[PDB]
Design a protein around this ligand. Structure first.
Ligand SMILES: Nc1ncnc2c1ncn2[C@@H]1O[C@H](COP(=O)(O)OP(=O)(O)O)[C@@H](O)[C@H]1O
Ligand SMILES: Nc1ncnc2c1ncn2[C@@H]1O[C@H](COP(=O)(O)OP(=O)(O)O)[C@@H](O)[C@H]1O
Lengths: 120, 233, 234, 120
């Protein structure tokens, strides 16, 4: 089955996204911040990254930048899921290599539709 | 205070309230669309998340309203005989869950024997303690194994002296004179992700000063902070 | 922005958000406490309320954020060719439930035949229409059998003229030149219970200004109001 | 069974309070504003009134005042259930003859406990 790296500083947020991903048979690996997410890429290669922006230690913009700078990391598709819904914030994220930006609050069903689209 | 801080304040309200709302909506929609895919314990767990996130949102609305009432000069205080040792322990218990989510240990010492009796409004002083305890958690170090917030209760100068000590990020010198102002937040690389309005310490200062007390701070950047609350006995 | 209005504004945020929050908490706790007694139909109904109330809360947070972005000048207009007849109808559909809860009929007329194209941002002009339609419902008469909000679409002066007309409480003359100000709300015995921040029309004005347009008002107290939005065609 | 007059401008709030009242076997009569509430006191006499403050046509403070004017209405216990949670708001409501003021947001279980106390 497909493997998703879920990167967000909220345990409550990770729980509900993980539940919806596991409804579709996907495996889920969690990271509490950007640095931990990049450390987890040494263990495995995910099929998709779900990434928040506002995290301690390393923010999502820094993560996106670091993903593009490493040969093996830059082709992993990333969906940014964030409360930072502004148009300049989206443009920056897309310019840093994110495939899609989705705003919080979000619809779990719409989120899973988009996860399916990128995984196929 | 100023108008640029008002705009930042309005944006900060939106973002702090958006986080619990995201959980409320995501959990509610998940339950609605997954009734056949939820066991009883998970259904109950997910409902509990909605309730607990609604309660945090409620507390954030109470902050806004208490601030407006303090600015209107409509917030009355009502004093009575209260044991502060029991009051502090109650506040410590109320924040343990939040402190655990950021790996912060919450401690309580008393330099004098308990009970420590004092003529105070119990709900408003609890609110002062909760604001200081919350800040100790919110502005704790990012990655450290020994993070704490400690309440030290003591009697001094014909009054009660409450110290809330932490080993968090600390506060720079130029900021120390402004942290008690309404809407003021330290804008740095160590606060960018921390939610807040800049009202907490403004509310705390006024509640303390309505009791005939004062509040001040000592802090070292990278070491931590000590907030001192003195109230007449 | 002035100090008395700012304090009033902060209190108004709390109260407007407290109403949907109250429903969310009461419905959620009721489900949790009554699982053994709730039938499936009612469980689903109660979850729908939580979701719908969360959506209203979300819209009120979007208002605060859009206002801050307009104040910072970071909010971006992206124009395209849009049919206004389709745009207005979509806005009318979006407000139907809220209008029904206050017994307000929502109408749509067009003096010009559809379609009517315009080079405009559809999301931002939708937001303008929703604010004016919301206000038409919020400030409708308290007890009347024939309450309405009507959107009238027309072409004029090398642009599109949208009129949002109501037969509501109306606006007094001293207030007419202040309603578009940030945080301004008419304080009277006909507005005390109506929730609001005073941001809606400030946002609407700004969005209209960014399109090279203007917004103005005509009103008579006790009769109703007409909000006029003029926007260039291309 | 005991009869409760439920006075609030929100249909959504009336629905959830009614559900919890009917769980305990109580009959529920609803009023969308203060004037309608007083109009319905002509057709019956409730054992409890649950009353909001911020309503169109007639607000809750005016209802409380008008309840004291008639000797028939003055004896009916009133629980104020309101978002107006300030101390001055509570004091006014209690001075106008309200037996209890409860704040919104509220716990339905705590609300029902207080309803039981006043009815018994
Ligand atoms: N214990 C603490 N350690 C470090 N900084 C603090 C602490 N408490 C408060 N501050 C600083 O003072 C500012 C104002 O605090 P407060 O008024 O509670 O507002 P908020 O927490 O919403 O930002 C904070 O933004 C933060 O920069
Ligand atoms: N259609 C209308 N009829 C009567 N008064 C209105 C109407 N629209 C707006 N107003 C008045 O203008 C004020 C500002 O409107 P707005 O900026 O939308 O803020 P809000 O609706 O949050 O108060 C309202 O408080 C109200 O007094």
């Amino acid at each position: 089955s497909k493997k998703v790296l879920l990167v967000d500083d909220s345990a409550v947020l990770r729980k509900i996204v993980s539940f919806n991903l596991k409804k579709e048979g996907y495996e889920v690996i969690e990271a509490e911040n950007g640095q931990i997410a990049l450390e987890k890429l040494s263990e495995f290669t995910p099929d998709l990254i779900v990434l928040a922006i506002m995290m301690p230690v390393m923010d999502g913009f820094t993560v996106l930048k670091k993903l593009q700078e490493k040969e093996e990391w830059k082709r992993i598709p990333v969906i940014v899921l964030t409360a930072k819904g502004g148009e300049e914030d989206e443009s920056l994220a897309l310019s840093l290599g994110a495939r899609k930006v989705m705003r919080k609050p979000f619809s779990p069903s719409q989120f899973i539709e988009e996860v399916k689209h990128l995984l196929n | 205070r100023i108008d640029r801080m008002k705009t930042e304040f309005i944006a900060n309200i939106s973002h702090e309230l958006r986080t619990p709302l995201t959980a409320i909506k995501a959990y509610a929609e998940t339950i609605y669309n997954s009734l056949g895919e939820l066991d009883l314990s998970t259904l109950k767990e997910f409902l509990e998340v909605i309730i607990d996130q609604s309660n945090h949102l409620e507390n954030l609305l109470n902050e806004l309203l208490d601030f407006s009432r303090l600015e209107r000069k409509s917030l009355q205080i009502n004093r009575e005989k209260v044991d502060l040792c029991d009051l502090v322990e109650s506040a410590v218990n109320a924040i343990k869950e939040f402190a655990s989510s950021h790996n912060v240990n919450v401690l309580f010492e008393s330099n004098v024997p308990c009970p420590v009796e004092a003529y105070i409004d119990p709900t408003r002083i609890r609110q002062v303690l909760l604001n200081l305890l919350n800040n100790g958690v919110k502005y704790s170090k990012k990655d450290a194994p020994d993070k704490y917030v400690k309440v030290i209760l003591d009697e001094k100068d014909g009054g009660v002296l409450i110290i809330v000590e932490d080993n968090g990020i600390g506060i720079p010198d130029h900021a120390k004179d402004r942290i008690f102002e309404q809407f003021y937040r330290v804008d740095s690389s160590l606060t960018y992700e921390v939610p807040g309005t800049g009202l907490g310490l403004a509310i705390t200062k006024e509640i303390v000063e309505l009791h005939g007390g004062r509040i001040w701070v000592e802090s070292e950047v990278g070491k931590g902070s000590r907030f001192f609350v003195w109230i007449p006995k």
